[PDB]
Each structure stands twice: as structure tokens, then as C-alpha cells.
Design a binder for this molecule. Structure first.
Ligand SMILES: O=C(O)Cc1cc2ccccc2s1
Length: 167
């Protein structure tokens, strides 16, 4: 038993809710919140900006130190950093950005990072401003992640569409 509330069950291990991931993280304070990162950990917009804004920019300060030491992530890759005021840990995962020309085939590699954590609060990787088809991203999630994933879909209309179209 855990602390997540009002999620629809999609599969044995995947749950979904129409929720702001920031508000969800503040309420639940999960062990792991997933950030929809880029390889530079430049948290300008979307989930990264909203999460970063909610940390008062501490996520970006930590991230710049991480990049200065380690260099950029790989598309499909991840790193674990602090969750600050939102979670124990933040798993920064780089899904391919279709709007930057990145290969959508790397989405499965991105979701494999979630398997290193027993429970995660996560967004829909490569969807929204990443340019991928969110229906596809949910299918790859369900077909790749074996650990317990709580998907927070921000967009109301998109949440309804994902549930109604889910096989
Ligand atoms: O939750 C949503 O509505 C769908 C989105 C996924 C995502 C990923 C990165 C950046 C923004 C967004 S919006």
C-alpha cells in the first residue's frame, strides 16, 4: 500500500490520473518524481520548468553543478538527483524530442530507466511540447515499465482521450 489517490488502473503496474505533477509531488512527496529532462538539464519549460519553478530554482542549481562535472546526458538516458521539496529523489529522464529531430525509437530506452525504481510519479515522456504522439508514449510505457508507475497527465482533454483509446 502507498499514498497515491484517485488513479485509474491501466495494467498490473501502470496507473493514471488527470493531475498537475507539481501539485501531485507536493501532496504525495513520493520517493521518486520523474522529470521530462533534456540532455543539458536546462529546465526551461514543461514538466522540467514547472518542477524547477516549484523548487525555487534549486533543481537548476543542482543540475548545472551535475552537468559541469559529468557532461550532458544521452537521449534515452537519465540521472538521479535530489527531489528537493517535491520528492526524495528526482529521476531526470531524456525522452526524444521530435520537435528537435530526435529518433522516436529512443522512447523505449528512456522508459527502461524507470525499471531501476520500485515506485515512480511520472509524466508522459516525449508527449506535450516533446512532439511525440501521447497515445504512443502511453503504449511504450505500459509495454516497457515493469515497476509501479503513477502517470500524472496535466491536460484534461488529453487524459480523457488516453483513457478512452487505451487497449
Ligand atoms: O501531461 C500532459 O498533459 C502531457 C505532457 C507531457 C509533457 C512532457 C514534457 C513537457 C510537457 C509535457 S505536457
Amino acid at each position: 500500500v502507498n499514498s497515491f489517490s484517485g488513479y485509474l488502473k491501466l495494467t498490473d503496474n501502470v496507473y493514471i490520473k488527470n493531475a498537475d505533477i507539481v501539485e501531485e509531488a507536493k501532496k504525495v512527496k513520493p520517493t521518486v518524481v520523474v522529470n521530462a529532462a533534456n540532455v543539458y538539464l536546462k529546465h526551461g519549460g514543461g514538466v522540467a520548468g514547472a518542477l524547477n519553478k516549484a523548487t525555487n530554482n534549486a533543481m537548476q542549481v543542482e543540475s548545472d553543478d551535475y552537468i559541469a562535472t559529468n557532461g550532458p546526458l544521452k537521449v534515452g538516458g537519465s540521472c538521479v538527483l535530489s527531489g528537493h521539496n517535491l520528492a526524495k529523489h528526482c529521476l531526470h529522464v531524456v525522452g526524444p524530442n521530435v520537435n528537435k529531430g530526435e529518433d522516436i525509437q529512443l522512447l523505449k530506452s528512456a522508459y527502461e530507466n524507470f525499471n531501476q525504481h520500485e515506485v515512480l510519479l511520472a509524466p508522459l515522456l516525449s508527449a506535450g511540447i516533446f512532439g511525440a504522439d501521447p497515445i504512443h508514449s502511453l503504449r511504450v510505457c505500459v509495454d516497457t515499465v515493469r515497476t509501479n508507475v503513477y502517470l500524472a497527465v496535466f491536460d484534461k482533454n488529453l487524459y480523457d482521450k488516453l483513457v478512452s483509446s487505451f487497449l
